[PDB]
Curated annotation (Swiss-Prot), chain A:
Interacts with CLK1 C-terminus. Associates with the U5 snRNP and NCOR1 deacetylase complexes. Identified in the spliceosome C complex. Serine/threonine kinase involved in spliceosomal assembly as well as mitosis and signaling regulation. Connects chromatin mediated regulation of transcription and pre-mRNA splicing. During spliceosomal assembly, interacts with and phosphorylates PRPF6 and PRPF31, components of the U4/U6-U5 tri-small nuclear ribonucleoprotein (snRNP), to facilitate the formation of the spliceosome B complex. Plays a role in regulating transcription and the spindle assembly checkpoint (SAC). Belongs to the protein kinase superfamily. CMGC Ser/Thr protein kinase family. Coiled coil: none annotated. The modification Phosphotyrosine is found at Y174. The modification Phosphoserine is found at S177. It is found in: Nucleus; Chromosome, Centromere, Kinetochore. The modification N6-acetyllysine is found at K42. It comes from the Eukaryota. Phosphorylated by CLK1. Autophosphorylated; phosphorylation inhibits interaction with its targets, such as PRPF6 or SMARCA4. This is Serine/threonine-protein kinase PRP4 homolog. The chain holds residues 676 to 1005 of 1007 of the full protein. Ubiquitous. ATP binds at T18, G19, Q20, G21, V22, F23, S24, N25, V26, K42.
From Swiss-Prot, chain B:
The modification N6-acetyllysine is found at K42. The modification Phosphoserine is found at S177. The active site is at D140 (proton acceptor). Serine/threonine kinase involved in spliceosomal assembly as well as mitosis and signaling regulation. Connects chromatin mediated regulation of transcription and pre-mRNA splicing. During spliceosomal assembly, interacts with and phosphorylates PRPF6 and PRPF31, components of the U4/U6-U5 tri-small nuclear ribonucleoprotein (snRNP), to facilitate the formation of the spliceosome B complex. Plays a role in regulating transcription and the spindle assembly checkpoint (SAC). Phosphorylated by CLK1. Autophosphorylated; phosphorylation inhibits interaction with its targets, such as PRPF6 or SMARCA4. This is Serine/threonine-protein kinase PRP4 homolog. It comes from Homo sapiens. ATP binds at T18, G19, Q20, G21, V22, F23, S24, N25, V26, K42. The modification Phosphotyrosine is found at Y174. Residues 12-322 form the Protein kinase domain. Ubiquitous. It is found in: Nucleus; Chromosome, Centromere, Kinetochore. The chain holds residues 676 to 1005 of 1007 of the full protein.
Length: 320, 322
């Protein structure tokens, strides 16, 4: 809703857009008060509840920035905030583009160089470590919410409008964006940092292949695709889920919805999905193997068997 | 103190020895009351202090067996106990030999197959898991206290005569047999389940190479051997140590003691000379496993237990997951 050339807060001169995505306009400005240095300004919706979550996003970045004084854990750095025409405005460090758009600039299904993915994975885990340390769930990790500097060497985890503290975790199967939504959310089993880990694993595969790992059209389709990888969901797990019903029968069989309407029943699924295959189309192969193995250890259906952050950080794929 | 022939408790015919494990002789018997099924009877030593830890022993085994009904977690199964000529007697499921003896039947520095080692690794971590779930430290894990069945497919962690609760952590620099003793014990830092995981690491290496990992002649030598692997101990950690003064100077430099008359040499930095992969060494399937073992060992052998790999994480490690 803002115009180019507009000066905001008597210092920020808006010279362009990063875009409307998707709950707030983010603009590029130069800051008169600081030698015309570049900033991003996120302008939150004119909106009764959009601003509630904007004030949320403010607090989470404070704690996260307070907790990372030397900024070494790769979360977006918030500078300050103000109000303009009844909009809360957040001022961030300037960052060129998100990984969604770098991936598009790489072309249909191409992916990033394995060097890049390797470096990015380490930065994302450092980010997961900083989050857990603060007892925060980011709860929407994917390429679209990861930003990078102009040189594309440093990434930052951004958009904390979905974030929450670990404790208040509501029981909704629609937490996190679908493609990156972990099985313990869908099923209704209690969850924590592991969902952020699951999401990272989802986007690492996407960073390297250029493809969405689990393009499920619904929660049922998601669980299906997950179990096409790790076989069926563990039984003790299936049972702890407040929504297990919606997805399994008392014989703990998976009820898979189809096309008109169909509802097949499966007692076991049997892994169909070849990660290592997908991670290649046509010493370099060395690392791709490691990455596959890394993806295998973080995409475990039971959160409790999922690789820890420090072990991820310590994994062979990272250590080169 | 027993005679082959001697029947114990009106039911156990003692027919052979496994021996004087250490603090008590252990013999093989058949149980008349059960169609002569095989048992081991452990006879604790007269001493009033020794039978005091025998009660302790009985206690931890009952707890551990109690908390593991299906026996999924690889601790020695106690059947029952009686008394005999004033000795406490523990009756265990019968078990062939320890890993100390199987290692010797393999020959000098030969070690076991990597298949067996990874199988044993999982079983050992499973035992570590039960111990933590019962808030017990074992505190003497090493090949000698790990028994195995006839076919050597299965092992059991045994000899809970050094075990303790986690809460009453006596600051002694001599918990655990020296070669398997973690640096936090020696430095006098506060310690917990981490010391059993360290011990497991040492015996996995020793299980595969046939070699003792840290054959240190003194506590000070052990620290030296451990920093050869990992580098100098973290300052953050050296400070938390009640016995830091024995090993590190005011500047936190390691003081390495040697004989011939005792000389001391100070090292400010100590850079890793120990090459784990090259020790610890056939085909690419195996070789890949051995690299995995080497990666797993490196997480286990972190000088600071705070950084040391957890049990659940160890169980999920690639080396285990096959």
């Amino acid at each position: 809703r803002v115009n180019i050339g507009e000066v905001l807060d008597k210092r920020y001169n808006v010279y362009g857009y990063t875009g409307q995505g998707v709950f707030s306009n983010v603009v590029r400005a130069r800051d008169n008060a600081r030698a015309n240095q570049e900033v991003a300004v996120k302008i939150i919706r004119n909106n009764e509840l959009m601003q509630k979550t904007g004030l949320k996003e403010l607090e989470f970045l404070k704690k996260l920035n307070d907790a990372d004084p030397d900024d070494k854990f790769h979360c977006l750095r918030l500078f300050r905030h103000f109000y303009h025409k009844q909009h809360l405005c957040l001022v961030f460090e300037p960052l060129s583009m998100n990984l969604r758009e770098v991936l598009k600039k790489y072309g249909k299904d191409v992916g990033l160089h394995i060097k890049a993915v390797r470096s990015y994975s380490q930065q994302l885990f450092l980010a997961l470590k900083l989050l857990k340390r603060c007892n925060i769930l980011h709860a929407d990790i994917k390429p679209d919410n990861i930003l990078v500097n102009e040189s594309k060497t440093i990434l930052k985890l951004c958009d904390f409008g979905s974030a929450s503290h670990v404790a208040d975790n509501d029981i909704t199967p629609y937490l996190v964006s679908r493609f990156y939504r972990a099985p313990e959310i869908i099923i209704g089993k209690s969850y924590d940092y592991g969902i952020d880990m699951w999401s990272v694993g989802c986007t690492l595969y996407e960073l390297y292949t250029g493809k969405i790992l689990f393009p499920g059209k619904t929660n049922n389709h998601m669980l299906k695709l997950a179990m096409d990888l790790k076989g069926k969901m563990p039984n003790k797990m299936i049972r702890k889920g407040v929504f297990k019903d919606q997805h399994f029968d008392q014989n703990l069989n998976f009820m898979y919805i189809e096309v008109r309407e169909k509802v097949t029943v499966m007692s076991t699924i049997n892994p169909t999905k070849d990660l290592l295959a997908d991670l290649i189309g046509c010493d370099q192969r060395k690392k791709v193997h490691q990455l596959k193995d890394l993806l295998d250890q973080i995409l475990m259906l039971d959160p409790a068997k999922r690789i820890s952050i420090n072990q991820a950080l310590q994994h062979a794929f990272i250590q080169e």
